[PDB]
Design a protein around this ligand. Structure first.
Ligand SMILES: [Ca+2]
Ligand SMILES: [Ru+3]
Lengths: 241, 240
């Protein structure tokens, strides 16, 4: 019955991970928006000294989110939060019970974190070449079960970890958001619509169809608008190679 | 079910998993792979990513250089750590309390997300050491200040991190890595200063456990194995 408060921002795929998991858990929780990139509140380092979103408080006396209590546990890092929610709500089966299937989930999260996430960041924020991102996405696609289903078969926190980024890619590309070149925008849009990426399109549709996604997504147009507020997405700048 | 870990002495990522297997009291086989200079043509059958460590689980007992298509192939060292914890619950490789478990997962993410890349920049590119020392101070601050491991009791979080911290000191003393002598001196002084007393206690506490002693070749031996790593460019240093 200990309280959960998630500090969030609409643009953030990392916060989105945790909202998805909390929905799948059936948890009671509070969200509180934080303008982390333009106007961080003076109290925010009390809930996350790293000064990043998401931040989570757990337990302690019930207080307004902008008056955080010293008594609540302060939990940082979205993948730690995903495992925490699985630990708190074992009856929700947010991970498999079989160790090998659980490892498929953990491996999928590590493949995304270690080989895809940095490519999304670099292509979008630095305009680095798109081909290494497409290669890493093909690798990640290859880890999915071939016939359908989610990363570990049944839905798990591995799918909460990955869908926020994949689901943003398609509308961001269509809206021309990102510092990559025109040439690489075309390349990416064609690749992601090609037979090469049919399996990951099915995966994105299957994850997006769940209520946990519908109830935590502002809508494509609204997410695009939130992304336009991000200082690092400098409108009118592109990098070419 | 059998466990085989494909390993290499120089590798801190493989080292993570050896430590956890020792703490679990698991029965397992290790098999060295010259992954950076002479990868066997069968190795992509155990890990298509072509990285160490690799792990097979179950299947028929076969020699490690003839892996079975029937064994489960597990990739990524942190996934292996959580796997071992799931396989050996009586070994208590994670806390049982959710908040203490989250401390362990957070500590692992802090290392992966903030510290490892700084070690890579400094050792492989010779970029300035100050951001690395800053990141190490942050990680140090996540430890319980008065003593203990990352989550209190020992856990896989400490398996995840000690291979990298333990290599830092003898690599610095050997001058191995692309950083300049000037930054080498600076790092050695900083890591001996009261600024970093807490992380020195942490390294001592982790190194003192049998799981470290039994998976460490010795400082001089580990330095010699690291000199075989192409990206450490033995004899080479970048300046300013
Ligand atoms: Ca496959
Ligand atoms: Ru390496």
């Amino acid at each position: 019955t200990k309280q959960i408060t998630l500090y969030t921002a609409t643009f953030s795929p990392y916060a989105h991970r945790v909202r998805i998991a909390l929905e799948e858990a059936g948890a009671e929780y509070t969200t509180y928006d934080v303008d982390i990139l333009r106007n961080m509140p003076d109290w925010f380092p009390l809930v996350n000294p790293l000064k990043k979103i998401p931040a989570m408080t757990f337990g302690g006396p019930e207080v307004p989110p902008d008056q955080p209590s010293p008594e609540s546990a302060k939990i940082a890092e979205s993948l730690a939060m995903l495992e925490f929610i699985a630990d708190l709500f074992p009856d929700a089966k947010l991970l498999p019970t079989d160790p090998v299937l659980r490892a498929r989930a953990r491996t999928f999260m590590a493949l995304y974190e270690n080989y895809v996430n940095g490519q999304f960041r670099d292509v979008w924020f630095l305009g680095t070449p798109a081909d290494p991102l497409l290669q890493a996405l093909e690798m990640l696609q290859g880890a999915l079960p071939p016939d359908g289903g989610f990363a570990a078969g049944e839905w798990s926190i591995a799918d909460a970890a990955v869908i926020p980024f994949l689901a943003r890619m398609f509308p961001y590309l269509e809206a021309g958001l990102g510092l990559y070149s025109k040439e690489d925008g075309v390349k990416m849009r064609k690749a992601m619509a090609s037979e090469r990426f049919a399996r990951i399109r099915q995966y994105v549709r299957d994850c997006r169809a769940r209520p946990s996604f519908a109830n935590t997504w502002a809508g494509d147009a609204e997410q695009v608008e939130a992304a336009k507020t991000v200082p690092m997405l400098r409108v009118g700048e592109h990098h070419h190679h």
